[PDB]
Design a binder for this molecule. Structure first.
Ligand SMILES: CN[C@@H]1[C@@H](O[C@H]2O[C@H](CO)[C@@H](N)[C@H](O)[C@H]2O)O[C@H]2C[C@@H](N)[C@@H](O[C@H]3[C@H](O)[C@@H](O)[C@H](N)C[C@@H]3N)O[C@@H]2[C@@H]1O
Ligand SMILES: [K+]
Ligand SMILES: [K+]
Ligand SMILES: [K+]
Ligand SMILES: [K+]
Ligand SMILES: [K+]
Ligand SMILES: [K+]
Ligand SMILES: [K+]
Ligand SMILES: [Mg+2]
Ligand SMILES: [Mg+2]
Ligand SMILES: [Mg+2]
Ligand SMILES: [Mg+2]
Ligand SMILES: [Mg+2]
Ligand SMILES: [Mg+2]
Ligand SMILES: [Mg+2]
Ligand SMILES: [Mg+2]
Ligand SMILES: [Mg+2]
Ligand SMILES: [Mg+2]
Ligand SMILES: [Mg+2]
Ligand SMILES: [Mg+2]
Ligand SMILES: [Mg+2]
Ligand SMILES: [Mg+2]
Ligand SMILES: [Mg+2]
Ligand SMILES: [Mg+2]
Lengths: 103, 117, 88, 64, 47
RNA sequence: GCUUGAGUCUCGUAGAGGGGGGUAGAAUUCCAGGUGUAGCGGUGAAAUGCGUAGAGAUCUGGAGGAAUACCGGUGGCGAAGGCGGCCCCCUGGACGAAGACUGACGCUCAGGUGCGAAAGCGUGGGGAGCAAACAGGAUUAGAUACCCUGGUAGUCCACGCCGUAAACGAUGUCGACUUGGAGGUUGUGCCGGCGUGGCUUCCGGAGCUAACGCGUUAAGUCGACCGCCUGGGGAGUACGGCCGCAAGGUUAAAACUCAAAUGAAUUGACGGGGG
């Protein structure tokens, strides 16, 4: 199991689906013996530039420990979920539990 | 014919020529002038003076619309960068903001080969 | 590279101890483990020439260690190449 | 170098207020020779800014 | 004229016209490396 | 036998090292539409070209390819060739600390084998930009050029081939030893200093060198092994062999001919070099 930092940006219209998305994704992680070391719903932020004409998006940050397989699966989920406008999965060396600079 | 008040002067300052196009803020053109169409060919076309005259003739082209405010968008390396803006201020437009909009690739396409003059 | 756990398993199987990491048998077993592991990599990544240079060093090092072991102790050599399923 | 002076481990792409000090008005990454950042931290900073730009936490350019 | 002098200075700061002049023609990587080395040796001779 | 060479293990560090996949933003081009109207473009000057069938400019939307500004650095990594957005996956090497382990397991290497820029070649894709060829416009005594407007191969991808470059540090690899000074980069010990490693620059001492220069990253002082040279031209050519789809590569002469060819530095003179 490896440590990953996941940021996903949701379409501001589907801001109300984000609690549902989080509980779905975190269940997919913990289902396969993973751990959510950090979750932060940053909410709707102004984008620094437009993405698909959107000037805002709803950011979620997740630091996760998980098998590679379920993270690959969560990446496919992001790709095909139309609500998720952008995502970034990054490997981290260790688990990050502390508050982000956003909170 | 219709009134606008606040438009945008687009200065296309190339090495060879200066095109001045005054648009509204939706980017719909109202009028335009060029150094090359202002009585300047060859060496003289690519000068700040010829660009000034182009700026003046463009102001004449948009006087019907009754523009008072211009945002100035400057595009390119040419001699008519500064002289065009001075001439627009001198025509009695209020210059509200000057942006450089010169396109820069973040790498982009391979440019033409160097000239062996 | 070989994981900490896979390394330690090979050291246990082939050494005289957990400390016996230097033994020719351990070294050859470790090189053999990674040579065998990397066959899957190079099956997929046929044009990874840079990594393959590291593989060919492992192969050459193993050959030199086996040739050392053969001339020092033929019976240890015979046992080792049997356990690891090497031709020579 | 602020980052050495604070014993910073890795620069965070998320720490936008920090990163804003090392970009110009245009959005361009400021050279280490201007800012006095150490080479090791300049490289982390460049990566962090590029990650922040991808997530649209920083602008690539002043004229998007 | 203050705001125009301010625009001028902002363009010099951003290095727009240096960037345009650089990108007018293709420089071979050999030529780029040769001038980078020339700039390094000159900057060293400054010291 | 031994542990000092050479390896293994443990923890960690930096990195455009490699392979695969994904993705982002800027820009160019094109397509469609809006505004708009006589120019645009180009040059030393022009013209070809483009434009009233509405260009250029400007705005909106779309398509597509290629490359990744800034960071960026006598910065880094790699055996060399080379490698630069970001993210993931697979993967190679280097280095440091402290300790354990093996016990000369080493160095070099003809033949052999592998890798090997760009161009080129084959098959299948792709094609924005650039651009051999080519076309037109100039320039010119001419101008099969330089300049301009276009533009095909190609440049891109997959797989296979080619096997060469001023593939250069024009400097083979390995080891040891021999005053200094100033930097960069990357570890690390101890208390901002003081050390101690790796890599990498500049200057310079002895010494060496024809000189230029090199100078602990030696071209110094030595040792091991390999490669290569033997006047210029003819010629890296011919012929033969081998290799290659080809282009060609590789190995490699002779006749004949000349009394030089050459290196470095010196004084002039000269320059459409500078001051
Ligand atoms: C300190 N090492 C340098 C070497 O570096 C090369 O080999 C090293 C390995 O040993 C590498 N680490 C390095 O990356 C690589 O570049 O290149 C040579 C090239 C040679 N013409 C001469 O240059 C001189 C010039 O010839 C002269 O004209 C100039 N004025 C001064 C130069 N030093 O001396 C240098 C010098 O010996
Ligand atoms: K999506
Ligand atoms: K041998
Ligand atoms: K073409
Ligand atoms: K001399
Ligand atoms: K040797
Ligand atoms: K040799
Ligand atoms: K002769
Ligand atoms: Mg041109
Ligand atoms: Mg790696
Ligand atoms: Mg190196
Ligand atoms: Mg050979
Ligand atoms: Mg090629
Ligand atoms: Mg082809
Ligand atoms: Mg062309
Ligand atoms: Mg041409
Ligand atoms: Mg050769
Ligand atoms: Mg080279
Ligand atoms: Mg070189
Ligand atoms: Mg050579
Ligand atoms: Mg020296
Ligand atoms: Mg010599
Ligand atoms: Mg031949
Ligand atoms: Mg032959």
């Amino acid at each position: 199991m490896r440590h990953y930092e996941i940021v996903f940006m949701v379409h501001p219209d589907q801001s109300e689906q984000v609690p549902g998305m989080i509980e779905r994704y975190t269940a997919a992680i913990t289902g396969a013996e993973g751990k959510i070391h950090r979750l932060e719903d940053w909410g709707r932020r102004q984008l620094a530039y437009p993405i698909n004409k959107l000037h805002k998006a709803h950011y979620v940050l997740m630091n996760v420990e998980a098998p590679q397989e379920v993270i690959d699966e969560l990446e496919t989920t992001f790709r095909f979920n139309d609500a998720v406008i952008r995502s970034m999965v990054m490997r981290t060396k260790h688990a990050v539990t502390e508050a982000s600079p956003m909170v | 014919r219709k009134q606008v008040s606040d438009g945008v002067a687009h200065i296309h300052a190339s090495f060879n020529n200066t095109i001045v196009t005054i648009t509204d803020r939706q980017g719909n053109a109202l009028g335009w002038a060029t150094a090359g169409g202002s009585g300047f060919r060859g060496s003289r076309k690519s000068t700040p003076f010829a660009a000034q005259v182009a700026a003046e003739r463009c102001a004449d082209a948009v006087k019907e619309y009754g523009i008072k405010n211009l945002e100035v968008m400057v595009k390119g390396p040419g001699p008519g960068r500064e002289s065009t803006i001075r001439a627009l201020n001198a025509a009695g437009f209020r210059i509200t903001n000057i942006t450089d909009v010169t396109p820069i690739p973040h790498x982009g396409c391979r440019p033409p080969k160097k000239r062996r003059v | 590279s070989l994981s900490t756990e896979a390394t330690a398993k090979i050291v246990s199987e082939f050494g005289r101890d957990a400390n016996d990491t230097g033994s020719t048998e351990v070294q050859v077993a470790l090189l053999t483990a990674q040579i065998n592991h990397l066959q899957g990599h190079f099956a997929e990544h046929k044009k990874d020439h840079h990594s393959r240079r590291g593989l060919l060093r492992m192969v050459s090092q193993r050959r030199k260690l086996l040739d050392y072991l053969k001339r020092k102790d033929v019976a240890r050599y015979t046992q080792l190449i049997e356990r690891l399923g090497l031709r020579r | 170098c602020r980052f050495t002076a604070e014993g910073v481990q890795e620069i965070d792409y998320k720490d936008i207020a920090t990163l804003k000090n090392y970009i110009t008005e245009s959005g361009k990454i400021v050279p280490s020779r201007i800012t006095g950042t150490r080479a090791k931290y300049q490289r982390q900073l460049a990566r962090a800014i590029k990650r922040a730009r991808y997530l649209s936490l920083l602008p690539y350019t002043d004229r998007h | 004229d203050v705001a125009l002098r301010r625009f001028k200075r902002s363009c010099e700061k951003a290095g727009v016209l240096a960037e345009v002049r650089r990108r007018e023609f293709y420089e071979k990587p050999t030529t780029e490396r040769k001038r980078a080395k020339a700039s390094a040796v000159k900057r060293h001779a400054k010291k």
